[PDB]
Amino acid sequence: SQIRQNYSTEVEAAVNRLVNLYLRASYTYLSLGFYFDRDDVALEGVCHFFRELAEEKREGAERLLKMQNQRGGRALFQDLQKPSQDEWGTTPDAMKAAIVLEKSLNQALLDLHALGSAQADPHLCDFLESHFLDEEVKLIKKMGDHLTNIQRLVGSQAGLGEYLFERLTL
Amino acid sequence: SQIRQNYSTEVEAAVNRLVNLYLRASYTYLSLGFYFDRDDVALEGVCHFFRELAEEKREGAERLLKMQNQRGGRALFQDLQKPSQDEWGTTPDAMKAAIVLEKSLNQALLDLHALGSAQADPHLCDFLESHFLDEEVKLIKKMGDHLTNIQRLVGSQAGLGEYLFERLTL
Amino acid sequence: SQIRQNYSTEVEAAVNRLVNLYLRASYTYLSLGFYFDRDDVALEGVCHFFRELAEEKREGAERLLKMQNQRGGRALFQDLQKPSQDEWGTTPDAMKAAIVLEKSLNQALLDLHALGSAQADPHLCDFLESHFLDEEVKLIKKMGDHLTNIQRLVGSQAGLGEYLFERLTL
Amino acid sequence: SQIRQNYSTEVEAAVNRLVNLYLRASYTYLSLGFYFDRDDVALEGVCHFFRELAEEKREGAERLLKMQNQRGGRALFQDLQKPSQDEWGTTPDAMKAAIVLEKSLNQALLDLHALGSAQADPHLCDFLESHFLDEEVKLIKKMGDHLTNIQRLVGSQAGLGEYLFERLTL
């Protein structure tokens, strides 16, 4: 309360939820990464792609937690739900799941921004714009590009297509 | 449609128009630059000033086109109207025309921002602020400074004033 | 008129037309480049190839404009017609369109050279030979090579062929 | 006669005349340069400009003489006529005289090229194009630029205009 200024309880709570969403996405990417590292899947390029995203999402959560404290809010942690799947199929299946996941994070950021706008919290709005919004847009475009390329390949010859993509793109 | 999210058809269309405006300004500056390179005009400093702006405006158009694709919109190109004049008069005449042109681009950016705000598109709003708005303000101030200096000189002795400005300022 | 010497009004006008043709080719390549940058097309190698040609054609137009002024002629700008297509199909379709475009520029250069010869303007003839003719021949050969390679690939397996070409040649 | 091949006696003679024209232009520029070095004229920038041209024209004559021997022709030297004037007036007067002189050299080059074309001597034609034609065009444009600038200055205030041009342009 000593430093808190123009920071609504509604934004404070939403921020805590967003932290949980980012940590859950990070957990999800950790599962995806290790699945492609399995000897009966063995696509190193995909394993690395997803393991790098797990780190990025974790870093996003830490940035939000730092902001929470900077504004005088209080971080509250909740249980982290296990990933939705235990096995992730093939490369196209995995990339599709990732795009859906990212679109859900992006929507949560947009909703939080709308809330900040309604509450008249310009610091929050700038923070999201400067560290999250552009990052999400660029990432989603990249995934879209990948999906297109994977689909053009696995339409031709599945096994061969997955290998070429992992070797030449990732 | 695979990556498109929170990107209205109204903004998509406005973006395409803005691209056309930037390319037309670039074409205009190309004409201005080469006019001052004429043997019967011969003011190298002015030629370079305008040719550098032609490049800047072209780069602005390319940045908008990249953004269009990043958001999942589709670029549509239209004819580019020739510059409004074939001959540009003297330095003060040319600088006045340039300021008018820039103010028109600035207004188009402001209108697009207002549209993005009404549509609740925070990525668009940040993109304009971060890459266009400040750039325009700084450029317009510079042109204003130039105009003031050129006018103080050509009020004294026209031919002599134009030469001194080109030699000592540009 | 002070510096103008042995520079016919017929060549002066033809030069202005050629400038318009080069700027239109540049505009065309800009459209081609951004089309391959679309998330539902996504062939970075092709995007870069065409975007590099847009720059080359623009530079050709600027070289002609500089020459115009050096000879004492006057540059006159016209509207730039939008590219002939909004969507460019697949890699082979795009490369075919590009070859047709280049052959048309090459013919315009040849016609201008013939005009210069008829007018007895050796400076013009050398200028074209030294900066345009060899450049066009080398470029057209390269495109021919590409077409042959793309066709040998997409005859086998289309999607797979386009990906391999973009990854291994471009 | 041992090495001579496809080298007409008409071109051989014309080459000898051209050598005389270049040496005479060099002599003319030497006079112009030293005139501006006079204590009662004293414009160092102009002195240097003309003295540099005297060297360039001399080098042009030596290049022609080397070519003459390379083709198996025989150099024949004639008297060199003194410059047309002993005193050169002011900067604008001198620059005007120089432009007239250059246009006369350029015409002689064009006439020689026409002769080479009629004689079907492609080596001569390339030699002129590669070492003289573009050089003349660029130089004449520069002089045109200077004249324009000098005239805009001396229209304002003569003495002051000549000084500024010499200080800021040359």
Tab-separated table of C-alpha atoms in Angstrom, chain C residues 21 99-109:
chain	number	residue	atom	x	y	z
C	21	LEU	CA	8.966	0.683	-67.228
C	99	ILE	CA	11.028	-14.163	-67.163
C	100	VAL	CA	8.306	-12.639	-69.334
C	101	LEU	CA	8.724	-9.341	-67.506
C	102	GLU	CA	12.494	-9.341	-67.968
C	103	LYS	CA	12.223	-10.190	-71.658
C	104	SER	CA	9.963	-7.171	-72.068
C	105	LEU	CA	12.491	-4.866	-70.337
C	106	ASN	CA	15.261	-6.325	-72.482
C	107	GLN	CA	13.273	-5.603	-75.653
C	108	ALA	CA	12.740	-2.018	-74.540
C	109	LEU	CA	16.490	-1.628	-74.013
